[PDB]
Amino acid sequence: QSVLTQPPSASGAPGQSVTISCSGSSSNIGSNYVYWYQQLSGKAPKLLIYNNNQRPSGVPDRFSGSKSGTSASLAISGLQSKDEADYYCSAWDSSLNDPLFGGGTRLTVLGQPKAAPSVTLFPPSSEELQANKATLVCLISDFYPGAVEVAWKADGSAVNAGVETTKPSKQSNNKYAASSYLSLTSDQWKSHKSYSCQVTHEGSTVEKTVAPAECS
Amino acid sequence: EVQLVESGGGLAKPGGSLRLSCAASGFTFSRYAIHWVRQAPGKGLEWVSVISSGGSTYYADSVEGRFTISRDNSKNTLSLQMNSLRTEDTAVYYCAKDATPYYYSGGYWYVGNYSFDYWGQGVLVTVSSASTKGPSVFPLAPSSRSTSESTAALGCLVKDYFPEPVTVSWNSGSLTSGVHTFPAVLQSSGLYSLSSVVTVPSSSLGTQTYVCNVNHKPSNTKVDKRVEIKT
Amino acid sequence: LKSDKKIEYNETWYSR
Ligand SMILES: *[C@@H]1O[C@H](CO[C@@H]2O[C@@H](C)[C@@H](O)[C@@H](O)[C@@H]2O)[C@@H](O[C@@H]2O[C@H](CO)[C@@H](O[C@@H]3O[C@H](CO)[C@@H](O)[C@H](O)[C@@H]3O)[C@H](O)[C@H]2NC(C)=O)[C@H](O)[C@H]1NC(C)=O
């Protein structure tokens, strides 16, 4: 009767509680069992709750499930940083004759300290320039929260063409990383005195600069 | 211990075909329906197909007619043949054991309850008009490291490869501390590029060699590249 | 047709 509606994101304080909602209709949530899955980064989902409110073997009681009308809710108390994951509701739809998943809810655990990004800028190699190309590489790591802005400059002028920047992704240390690539011709690289990668995080901007090397 | 070990997958062209397989152990295979559930990159879960113990097959609307699921209860194996592949079929595919054994009720045999207590490791399926391409590996070194810099960042740019994934090690896995391999960027050309970096002491340059080992299995390519600073 | 994805439809299970 629809696709189950979940909020894209949810947050909670460590040691506290959070509630993830899941809204559907009478032909799914209202009349059928609801299941909840947890999916950590890079891992397969795991059955967290079944039959509206039952816990599988090994699921702590701080995970609870409940249903009311056309909505279902997953409550997580005693929040730990390891609880950061994507949470999915699921239910049968007899009108559609199909099993349905919710869109997922990304859970954030607040309280992690802010961290300024480490930025490393690499000029193109002589090999690539021998191939008449020049890729500049800006590597950003160890920053929290996971939101950065990357601007490229060439001798003070703004660079718009040839920029490709990844979305930030969580590292193993729960901090974030990202990469920006500036793809130029060798003619562009050698007709400038310098290029700069400017990474802005929490209003603070750091800058790295590379220049064509004479080597002689 | 329950195991669902997947194999197959890989890259196909629009209209092409791929076969996934799932090997099950650690439970009574013939008592449970087995499903396939997929997940597009950075997207949510979507049920794909199911096969019951008795051979009943059901499919999602988007794949009906294009996908054929089958199982072998004597071999404890399951397969999903995927024809007429489309761009939107690009996803990680999991085989998933139904949490409820088949049961009789109200005059009907029921295959399962469409909840999944055990999941395979997942296999990547990419559908794209671009062909497989091995990477170009370039060294990443500073133009000139001053003496005041006690450390130096060395790296490898793994450029213009398709499809994912790529693995990088340093010195055949003997160098791990300080290694940071970044998730790839997707270029407008449809090709990927990633970079791997490692911070090493400056006093080791000229004494220790630093080689990045790049493995692109989809193109069956391996590259070893030594990285030095030309200063 | 396949109007109920929860039902086993192997005839051996109902008429054998
Ligand atoms: C596995 O599933 C069966 C079947 O239930 C149906 O299919 C599932 C995939 C889910 O989508 C269910 O939501 C869906 O109904 C479960 O058996 C069912 O249990 C419910 C609740 O106990 C029964 O509903 C009851 O109906 C009576 C009237 O006869 C009312 O008085 C009750 O208040 C209640 O509403 C339902 O009849 C029953 N269906 C069958 C075919 O048995 C089962 O519990 C579930 N889990 C297992 C087997 O572990």
Is A4 inside any structural domain?
A: no
Query: Does residue A151 sit in the same domain as residue A84?
Result: no
Residue A15 is assigned to a structural domain of this protein? yes
- Cα of A97 to nearest chain C Cα, Å: 6
Tell me, using a 6 A CB cutoff, whether residue B65 lines ligand 1: no
Identity of the residue numbered B104: Y
In a domain, A2, yes or no: no
Task: Report yes or no: B91 and B107 within 8 Å, Cβ to Cβ.
Answer: no
Q: Could you tell me if A94 and A122 lie in one domain?
A: no
How many angstroms away from the CA of B55 is the closest CA of chain A? 18
**Does A131 share its domain with A99?**
no
- Decide the pairing of beta strands A86-93 and A71-76: unpaired
How buried is B28 (Cβ within 10 angstroms: 0-12 exposed, 13-18 middle, 19+ buried)?
exposed
**A205 and A153 Cβ atoms separated by less than 8 Å:** no
- Which 8-state DSSP code applies to residue B208? S
Chain centroid to Cα A168, Å, comes to: 6
Chains that touch B (3 or more CB pairs under 8 A): A, C
Which of B98, B226, B222 has the alpha carbon at shortest distance from B161? B222
CATH number reported for the structural domain that contains residue A60 in this entry:
2.60.40.10
Distances (CA, A) of B1 to A169, A196, B27, B28, B110: 32, 54, 8, 12, 26
Place of tokens 């099993």: A99
Cα B68 to ligand 1 centroid, rounded to whole Å? 29
A84 and A173 both lie in a single domain:
no
Q: Tell me the two tokens of residue A178.
A: 């990202």
- For residue B163, whether the previous peptide bond is cis, meaning omega lies within 30 degrees of 0, is yes
Q: Which residue from A minimizes the CA distance to B188?
A: A164
Q: Are B34 and A93 in contact (CB under 8 A)?
A: no
Q: How far apart are the CA of A57 and the centre of ligand 1, in A?
A: 21
Q: Running DSSP on this structure, what letter comes out for residue B57?
A: E
HSE-CB of B50 using CA atoms within 13 angstroms: 30
Give the nearest chain B residue to A35 (CA atoms). Answer: B115
Whole-number Å distance between alpha carbons of A145 and A168? 10
Does A33 sit in the ligand 1 pocket, CB within 6 Å?
Answer: yes
Residue A195 lies in a domain: yes
Q: Are residues A74 and A32 in the same domain?
A: yes
Residue A1 lies in a domain: no
CA distance B195 to B140: 9
Tell me the residue range of the domain where A94 lies.
Answer: 9-109
Structure tokens at A77: 């108390």
Cα separation, A128 vs B110, whole angstroms: 62
- Are both A68 and A26 inside the same structural domain? yes
For residue A191, give every residue at least 6 positions away whose Cβ sits within 8 Å of its Cβ, in sequence order, or none. none
From B62's Cα to the closest Cα of chain C, the distance in A is 15
Q: Please answer yes or no on whether A137 and B153 come within 8 Å at the CB atom.
A: no
**Helix, strand, or coil here: B1?**
coil
With a 6 Å cutoff on the Cβ, whether A50 touches ligand 1 is no
Of B113, B114, B115, B117, the one to substitute when testing ligand 1's pocket (max ligand atoms within 8 A of C-beta) is B113
Instruction: Please state, in angstroms and as integers, the Cα–Cα distance from residue B97 to each residue in A40, A181, B21, following that order.
Output: 19, 42, 14
| Minimal-distance CA residue of chain A relative to C5 | A97
Q: C1 to chain B, minimum CA–CA distance in Å?
A: 11
Phi, psi of A130 (to 5 degrees): -60, -30
CB A32 within 8 A of CB A93: yes
| 8 A C-beta contact, residue B198 and residue B123 | no
Instruction: Answer with the one of A109, A128, A151 that is the final residue of a domain.
Output: A109
* DSSP labels, B148-167: T--EEEEEEEEEEEBSS--E
Domain final residue pick, A81, A109, A137: A109
This PDB structure is determined at a resolution in Å of: 2.3
Question: Under a CB-based contact definition with an 8 Å cutoff, are residues A5 and A23 in contact?
Answer: yes
Chains in contact with C, counting 3 or more C-beta pairs less than 8 Å apart as contact? A, B
Assigned domain for A24 exists: yes
Are residues A139 and A197 both part of a single domain? yes
The dihedral built from the CA positions of residue A133, A167, B196 and B94, taken in this order, carries a sign that is: negative
| Assigned domain for A215 exists | no
Choose the mutation target among A27, A97, A100 for the interface with C, i.e. most C CBs under 10 Å: A97
Scan for tokens 């994951």, then name that residue: A85
Show the domains of chain B with their CATH numbers.
Answer: 3-127 (2.60.40.10), 136-227 (2.60.40.10)
What tokens were used for B36? 């396939």
When divided into structural domains, chain A yields a total of 2
Instruction: Report the alpha-carbon distance of residue A184 to residue B142 in Å, rounded.
Output: 18
Helix (H, G, I), strand (E, B) or coil at B209: coil
Residue for token pair 């349905």: A100
Whole-angstrom Cα distance, residue C14 to residue C16?
Answer: 6
Q: Per DSSP, which regions of chain A are E strands?
A: 9-12, 18-23, 34-39, 46-49, 63-68, 71-76, 86-93, 98-101, 105-109, 118-122, 133-143, 149-154, 157-159, 163-165, 169-170, 176-185, 195-201, 204-210
CA B223/CA B168 separation, integer angstroms: 10
Contact criterion met (CB below 8 Å) for A122 and A146: no
As a whole number of angstroms, the distance between CA B124 and CA B10 comes to 6
Same domain for A71 and A146, yes or no, is: no
Q: Is A108 within 8 Å of A174 (Cβ atoms)? A: no
Residues A36 and A90 in one domain: yes
Burial (Cβ within 10 Å: 0-12, 13-18, ≥19) of residue B217: exposed
In 3D, which of B99, B46, B58 has the Cα closest to residue A100? B46
Cβ–Cβ under 8 Å, residues B208 and B191: no
Q: Are residues A101 and A122 located together in one domain of the fold? A: no
Residues A122 and A166 grouped into a single domain: yes
What's B68's DSSP letter? E
Rounded to the nearest 10°, the torsion over CA B80, B85, B91, B96 is -20
For residue A33, the ligand 1 atom closest to its alpha carbon is: 13
CB pairs under 8 A between A and C: 6
Q: Would A198 be classed as within a structural domain?
A: yes
C7 and B111: CB-CB below 8 Å? yes
Positive or negative CA dihedral for B153, B158, B160, B161?
negative
Residues A52 and A22 in one domain: yes
